């Protein structure tokens, strides 16, 4: 009872291996759960182009993801999107908000992704995703997500101006050291839930770090969130921004950690 959708088209990517990382994550889920992914979009090379150029280039991929996600959300399965970049969610979050006006979106990211055309310093579309879905600027793929229904989880070291856009819009922020499973449950209340994860939320490293306090979220904290959200309330999950080359040992190790984090929710949906 899992629908797997995989973006393989460029959506503003500035990193070299996020399309490959999405493909490898999808393969691991196919093998573990006996699934066959629906792959959407054609790869293209990364570039440092302005959002106003990258966004129109991505239209075909974004429309195709929108159509696949809509069909899955209207059905009876768990919708799982394995996305190259967070910017794919410019297509999906408006669908979630329209079909589930009461949903809470847990936007789990080391960043706020809440810049607008006026406030971006780098021009990167990936830094403008949640603000676009909430209608602070027009992505051309809709809006309609209430900022009051969006919760940034794990975000830290946010620029002062962006943090004030977040505050004024009403988006809640739960930093890593507050992001226990219960803190997240308290924020969701009785709502159905959509989980979006950018892996840059995670504390760097895989070695033991028992005597220092982490700056990012630990894998165990993400797993605890997936364990705590009731299966009956979970609409879908997006896994984004694994930068790891195809056929690398690094990608193999990274996807094993991902499977451990998501297993509580995916196991429940499968059975
Ligand atoms: Mg469903
Ligand atoms: Mn992001
Ligand atoms: Mn991020």
Short mmCIF file of C-alpha atoms and ligand atoms in Angstrom, two decimals:
data_model
loop_
_atom_site.label_atom_id
_atom_site.label_comp_id
_atom_site.label_asym_id
_atom_site.label_seq_id
_atom_site.Cartn_x
_atom_site.Cartn_y
_atom_site.Cartn_z
CA UNK A 1 0.00 0.00 0.00
CA UNK A 2 2.89 2.35 -0.90
CA UNK A 3 2.97 4.41 -4.11
CA UNK A 4 6.56 5.33 -5.01
CA UNK A 5 7.14 8.33 -7.31
CA UNK A 6 10.70 9.35 -8.24
CA UNK A 7 11.82 12.66 -9.72
CA UNK A 8 14.69 12.37 -12.19
CA UNK A 9 14.28 15.70 -13.96
CA UNK A 10 16.32 18.74 -13.03
CA UNK A 11 14.51 21.16 -10.76
CA UNK A 12 17.10 23.94 -10.28
CA UNK A 13 19.76 21.51 -8.97
CA UNK A 14 23.07 23.17 -8.01
CA UNK A 15 24.56 19.92 -6.64
CA UNK A 16 25.98 17.23 -8.91
CA UNK A 17 24.57 14.02 -7.43
CA UNK A 18 21.01 14.67 -6.15
CA UNK A 19 19.35 13.04 -9.18
CA UNK A 20 21.63 10.04 -8.63
CA UNK A 21 20.94 10.03 -4.89
CA UNK A 22 17.20 9.98 -5.53
CA UNK A 23 17.62 7.05 -7.93
CA UNK A 24 19.67 5.08 -5.40
CA UNK A 25 17.19 5.79 -2.57
CA UNK A 26 14.34 4.64 -4.80
CA UNK A 27 16.22 1.42 -5.67
CA UNK A 28 16.71 0.63 -1.98
CA UNK A 29 12.99 1.10 -1.30
CA UNK A 30 12.01 -0.99 -4.34
CA UNK A 31 14.21 -3.86 -3.12
CA UNK A 32 13.07 -3.68 0.51
CA UNK A 33 9.33 -3.28 -0.08
CA UNK A 34 8.84 -5.07 -3.41
CA UNK A 35 7.82 -1.87 -5.19
CA UNK A 36 8.32 -0.48 -8.67
CA UNK A 37 8.79 3.26 -8.79
CA UNK A 38 7.12 5.64 -11.22
CA UNK A 39 10.08 7.66 -12.57
CA UNK A 40 9.29 11.15 -13.88
CA UNK A 41 11.50 13.60 -15.75
CA UNK A 42 14.75 13.51 -17.72
CA UNK A 43 18.11 14.27 -16.07
CA UNK A 44 20.07 17.39 -16.99
CA UNK A 45 23.32 18.78 -15.57
CA UNK A 46 23.47 21.00 -12.50
CA UNK A 47 24.00 24.74 -12.97
CA UNK A 48 24.07 27.96 -10.92
CA UNK A 49 21.20 29.64 -12.75
CA UNK A 50 18.75 32.15 -11.32
CA UNK A 51 15.39 30.84 -10.11
CA UNK A 52 13.71 32.84 -12.89
CA UNK A 53 15.51 30.67 -15.47
CA UNK A 54 15.56 27.35 -13.60
CA UNK A 55 11.86 27.46 -12.76
CA UNK A 56 10.57 27.57 -16.37
CA UNK A 57 13.12 24.91 -17.40
CA UNK A 58 11.62 22.60 -14.76
CA UNK A 59 7.97 23.06 -15.79
CA UNK A 60 7.54 19.73 -17.61
CA UNK A 61 8.99 17.75 -14.70
CA UNK A 62 6.96 19.70 -12.14
CA UNK A 63 3.68 19.20 -14.04
CA UNK A 64 4.36 15.47 -14.35
CA UNK A 65 5.13 15.15 -10.64
CA UNK A 66 1.97 17.12 -9.83
CA UNK A 67 -0.14 14.72 -11.87
CA UNK A 68 1.41 11.61 -10.32
CA UNK A 69 1.14 12.96 -6.77
CA UNK A 70 -2.49 14.01 -7.29
CA UNK A 71 -3.51 10.53 -8.40
CA UNK A 72 -1.73 8.97 -5.43
CA UNK A 73 -3.19 11.39 -2.86
CA UNK A 74 -6.69 10.73 -4.22
CA UNK A 75 -6.20 6.95 -3.84
CA UNK A 76 -5.82 4.77 -0.78
CA UNK A 77 -2.04 4.26 -0.45
CA UNK A 78 0.82 6.08 1.26
CA UNK A 79 2.31 8.58 -1.21
CA UNK A 80 6.12 8.41 -1.17
CA UNK A 81 8.06 10.86 -3.32
CA UNK A 82 11.82 10.43 -3.70
CA UNK A 83 12.85 13.84 -5.03
CA UNK A 84 16.18 15.16 -6.28
CA UNK A 85 15.61 18.62 -4.74
CA UNK A 86 13.23 20.30 -2.31
CA UNK A 87 12.00 22.41 -5.24
CA UNK A 88 10.00 19.45 -6.55
CA UNK A 89 7.66 20.27 -3.66
CA UNK A 90 6.56 23.47 -5.40
CA UNK A 91 4.40 21.02 -7.37
CA UNK A 92 3.29 18.72 -4.58
CA UNK A 93 2.56 20.94 -1.56
CA UNK A 94 -0.29 22.86 -3.29
CA UNK A 95 -1.93 19.50 -4.05
CA UNK A 96 -1.60 18.39 -0.42
CA UNK A 97 -3.17 21.64 0.81
CA UNK A 98 -6.07 21.48 -1.65
CA UNK A 99 -6.93 17.83 -0.99
CA UNK A 100 -6.26 17.99 2.77
CA UNK A 101 -6.95 21.56 3.96
CA UNK A 102 -6.42 20.37 7.56
CA UNK A 103 -3.04 18.73 6.93
CA UNK A 104 0.04 19.85 8.85
CA UNK A 105 3.23 19.89 6.75
CA UNK A 106 6.36 18.95 8.72
CA UNK A 107 9.13 20.58 6.65
CA UNK A 108 12.23 18.93 8.10
CA UNK A 109 15.30 20.86 6.86
CA UNK A 110 18.43 22.50 8.20
CA UNK A 111 17.24 25.62 6.37
CA UNK A 112 13.97 27.55 6.32
CA UNK A 113 13.56 27.45 2.51
CA UNK A 114 11.46 30.59 3.02
CA UNK A 115 13.10 33.18 0.76
CA UNK A 116 11.27 35.22 -1.85
CA UNK A 117 12.53 36.83 -5.08
CA UNK A 118 13.14 40.04 -3.14
CA UNK A 119 15.04 38.43 -0.25
CA UNK A 120 17.15 35.68 -1.83
CA UNK A 121 20.89 36.33 -1.77
CA UNK A 122 21.81 33.45 -4.09
CA UNK A 123 18.88 33.25 -6.51
CA UNK A 124 18.42 29.55 -5.67
CA UNK A 125 14.92 28.14 -6.16
CA UNK A 126 15.60 25.51 -3.50
CA UNK A 127 15.74 28.25 -0.90
CA UNK A 128 12.25 29.49 -1.91
CA UNK A 129 10.15 26.32 -1.70
CA UNK A 130 8.09 26.66 1.48
CA UNK A 131 7.43 30.36 0.90
CA UNK A 132 6.24 29.56 -2.62
CA UNK A 133 3.86 26.84 -1.48
CA UNK A 134 2.51 29.27 1.15
CA UNK A 135 1.95 31.98 -1.49
CA UNK A 136 4.48 34.63 -0.48
CA UNK A 137 5.61 34.55 -4.14
CA UNK A 138 4.08 32.93 -7.23
CA UNK A 139 5.88 29.84 -8.49
CA UNK A 140 3.38 29.21 -11.30
CA UNK A 141 2.44 25.88 -9.67
CA UNK A 142 -0.10 27.16 -7.17
CA UNK A 143 -0.01 27.83 -3.46
CA UNK A 144 -2.75 27.49 -0.85
CA UNK A 145 -0.74 25.96 2.01
CA UNK A 146 -1.52 27.98 5.12
CA UNK A 147 1.72 29.07 6.84
CA UNK A 148 -0.17 28.30 10.09
CA UNK A 149 -0.21 24.63 8.96
CA UNK A 150 3.54 24.47 8.23
CA UNK A 151 6.15 23.53 10.85
CA UNK A 152 9.88 23.82 10.17
CA UNK A 153 11.65 21.02 12.05
CA UNK A 154 15.43 21.00 12.58
CA UNK A 155 16.09 24.40 11.05
CA UNK A 156 18.88 26.49 12.56
CA UNK A 157 21.17 29.42 11.82
CA UNK A 158 18.49 31.15 9.73
CA UNK A 159 19.26 34.60 8.31
CA UNK A 160 17.68 37.38 10.38
CA UNK A 161 15.46 38.70 7.60
CA UNK A 162 14.25 35.26 6.51
CA UNK A 163 13.53 34.36 10.13
CA UNK A 164 11.26 37.42 10.36
CA UNK A 165 9.39 36.45 7.16
CA UNK A 166 8.83 33.04 8.80
CA UNK A 167 7.67 34.64 12.04
CA UNK A 168 5.35 37.17 10.37
CA UNK A 169 3.75 34.48 8.22
CA UNK A 170 3.06 32.28 11.24
CA UNK A 171 5.33 29.32 10.41
CA UNK A 172 6.44 27.53 13.60
CA UNK A 173 10.10 26.48 14.00
CA UNK A 174 11.23 23.53 16.15
CA UNK A 175 15.08 23.54 16.27
CA UNK A 176 17.04 20.25 16.58
CA UNK A 177 17.41 20.32 20.37
CA UNK A 178 13.64 20.77 20.80
CA UNK A 179 12.68 18.30 18.03
CA UNK A 180 11.68 15.33 20.14
CA UNK A 181 8.91 13.07 18.88
CA UNK A 182 6.47 14.51 21.42
CA UNK A 183 7.28 18.11 20.50
CA UNK A 184 6.40 17.24 16.91
CA UNK A 185 3.19 15.45 17.94
CA UNK A 186 2.20 18.47 20.02
CA UNK A 187 2.56 20.68 16.94
CA UNK A 188 0.45 18.40 14.70
CA UNK A 189 -2.49 18.04 17.21
CA UNK A 190 -5.27 16.00 15.53
CA UNK A 191 -4.30 16.76 11.94
CA UNK A 192 -3.32 14.47 9.07
CA UNK A 193 0.38 14.87 8.31
CA UNK A 194 2.64 15.33 5.29
CA UNK A 195 6.38 14.88 5.96
CA UNK A 196 9.00 16.61 3.74
CA UNK A 197 12.67 15.89 4.53
CA UNK A 198 15.84 17.57 3.21
CA UNK A 199 18.74 15.43 4.40
CA UNK A 200 20.87 18.51 5.16
CA UNK A 201 18.91 18.58 8.43
CA UNK A 202 21.15 15.76 9.70
CA UNK A 203 24.17 16.24 11.93
CA UNK A 204 27.29 15.56 9.81
CA UNK A 205 29.22 12.39 10.60
CA UNK A 206 28.59 8.71 11.27
CA UNK A 207 31.25 8.19 14.00
CA UNK A 208 30.43 8.14 17.74
CA UNK A 209 29.96 11.68 19.13
CA UNK A 210 28.81 10.85 22.69
CA UNK A 211 30.51 13.80 24.48
CA UNK A 212 29.36 16.77 22.41
CA UNK A 213 25.93 18.22 21.67
CA UNK A 214 24.97 18.01 17.97
CA UNK A 215 24.01 21.04 15.90
CA UNK A 216 21.83 19.06 13.50
CA UNK A 217 19.23 16.38 14.03
CA UNK A 218 20.32 12.82 14.65
CA UNK A 219 18.98 9.89 12.58
CA UNK A 220 17.42 8.56 15.79
CA UNK A 221 15.39 11.76 16.11
CA UNK A 222 14.01 11.40 12.60
CA UNK A 223 13.18 7.75 13.21
CA UNK A 224 11.37 8.73 16.40
CA UNK A 225 9.16 11.13 14.42
CA UNK A 226 8.24 8.39 11.95
CA UNK A 227 7.48 6.04 14.88
CA UNK A 228 5.21 8.63 16.55
CA UNK A 229 2.96 9.76 13.66
CA UNK A 230 -0.01 7.33 13.51
CA UNK A 231 -0.20 5.41 10.25
CA UNK A 232 -3.86 6.38 9.87
CA UNK A 233 -2.87 10.07 9.86
CA UNK A 234 0.13 9.98 7.47
CA UNK A 235 -0.76 11.30 3.99
CA UNK A 236 2.70 11.07 2.46
CA UNK A 237 6.43 11.45 2.72
CA UNK A 238 8.97 13.25 0.51
CA UNK A 239 12.67 12.34 0.75
CA UNK A 240 14.90 14.97 -0.85
CA UNK A 241 18.50 16.09 -1.36
CA UNK A 242 20.71 13.03 -0.98
CA UNK A 243 23.90 14.15 -2.77
CA UNK A 244 25.77 10.91 -3.39
CA UNK A 245 27.14 9.52 -6.67
CA UNK A 246 25.58 6.61 -8.47
CA UNK A 247 27.32 3.34 -7.60
CA UNK A 248 29.34 4.78 -4.79
CA UNK A 249 29.94 3.12 -1.48
CA UNK A 250 28.86 6.42 0.02
CA UNK A 251 25.40 6.17 -1.54
CA UNK A 252 25.08 2.56 -0.37
CA UNK A 253 25.82 3.57 3.23
CA UNK A 254 23.56 6.62 3.06
CA UNK A 255 20.52 4.72 1.82
CA UNK A 256 20.91 2.14 4.60
CA UNK A 257 20.62 4.97 7.15
CA UNK A 258 17.60 6.36 5.28
CA UNK A 259 15.83 3.00 5.30
CA UNK A 260 16.35 2.73 9.08
CA UNK A 261 14.82 6.19 9.65
CA UNK A 262 11.72 5.65 7.49
CA UNK A 263 11.04 2.00 8.34
CA UNK A 264 8.49 2.63 11.16
CA UNK A 265 6.15 4.42 8.76
CA UNK A 266 6.83 2.46 5.56
CA UNK A 267 6.56 -0.92 7.31
CA UNK A 268 3.17 0.09 8.69
CA UNK A 269 1.89 1.25 5.31
CA UNK A 270 3.09 -1.93 3.59
CA UNK A 271 1.54 -4.17 6.26
MG1 LIG B 1 -2.84 7.99 1.19
MN1 LIG B 2 15.55 22.21 1.47
MN1 LIG B 3 18.25 22.44 3.50
#
